[PDB]
């Protein structure tokens, strides 16, 4: 009302605008990196699936989601959230894994000890393969392994977009067992199985990164939006402002004059 109140708004809204933009370039850097660095990975993770769509998977029964780690993540997290509570029961057991602590931040909010561990540093500095191997490792010892999963991540498409993708787990050696899978082999289900291992990292890395790629650019996107939005809003206030602003003066002059149209 009072120009003040308006300023409580304005002030901060400006601040926001700038800030939002701050978050934007930042996001963009993150993003920038995120594309670039995606390349060997691209190959690599694509590599992981190579014989996993040519190797065909009777999933014999580690559902994991990959998303952001942050507020201002758009629906990076939400998409996987949806699509991963929808799941969790079949591959049998409700056990869920969140790489991305925004995964489990929506599916934190609807599951918790069906996770085994969940990871951050996914955002707030961007993931690495190692990490993928680490998680790859942990996945195993957790006997949720051998109840099969799907690995859900935000598969990037473009800055704006990813398509939350999902695959089913192939880190089970019971996929490395039997099936028609076997007939594509001339090698035993050990070094295969130790690829189920190895590939878990590859893919996990990849996906992990994919998600984060999706995320970072979306994080800019969020940052675009807001700072424009903020602007528009400001504009409107700014009228209303002046008007009241002036209004006052008029009224004030009035009150004086009309007070000078009254006894003294």
């Amino acid at each position: 009302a009072t120009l003040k109140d308006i300023t409580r708004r304005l002030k901060s809204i400006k601040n926001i605008q700038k800030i939002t933009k701050s978050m934007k370039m930042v996001a963009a850097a993150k993003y920038a990196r995120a594309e670039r660095e995606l390349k060997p990975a691209r190959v690599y993770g694509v590599g992981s699936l190579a014989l996993y769509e040519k190797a065909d998977i009777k999933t014999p029964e580690l559902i994991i989601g990959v998303s952001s780690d942050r507020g201002l993540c758009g629906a990076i997290h939400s998409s996987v959230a949806k699509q991963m509570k929808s799941e969790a029961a079949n591959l049998k057991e409700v056990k869920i894994i969140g790489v991305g602590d925004k995964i489990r931040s929506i599916l934190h909010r609807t599951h918790s000890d069906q996770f085994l561990v969940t990871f951050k540093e996914v955002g707030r500095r961007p993931p690495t393969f190692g990490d993928a191997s680490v998680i790859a490792l942990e996945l195993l010892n957790s006997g949720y392994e051998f109840d099969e999963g799907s690995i859900i991540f935000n598969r990037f498409r473009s800055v704006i977009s990813y398509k939350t993708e999902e695959k089913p787990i192939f880190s089970l050696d019971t996929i490395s067992s039997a099936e028609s899978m076997s007939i594509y082999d001339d090698i035993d289900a050990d070094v295969l199985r130790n690829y189920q291992e190895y590939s878990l990292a590859n893919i996990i890395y990849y996906s992990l990164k994919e998600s984060t790629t999706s995320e970072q650019s979306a994080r800019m996107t969020a940052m675009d939006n807001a700072s424009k939005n903020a602007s528009e809003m400001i504009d409107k206030l700014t009228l209303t402002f002046n008007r009241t602003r002036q209004a006052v003066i008029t009224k004030e002059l009035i009150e004086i004059i009309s007070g000078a149209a009254a006894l003294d």
Binding site: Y44, G47, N194
Partner: peptide
């Protein structure tokens, strides 16, 4: 280390 992935067809993926 790593894995070689020998995909039936012309392709080898040394990962």
């Amino acid at each position: 280390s790593g894995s070689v992935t020998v995909n039936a067809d012309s392709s080898v993926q040394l990962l």
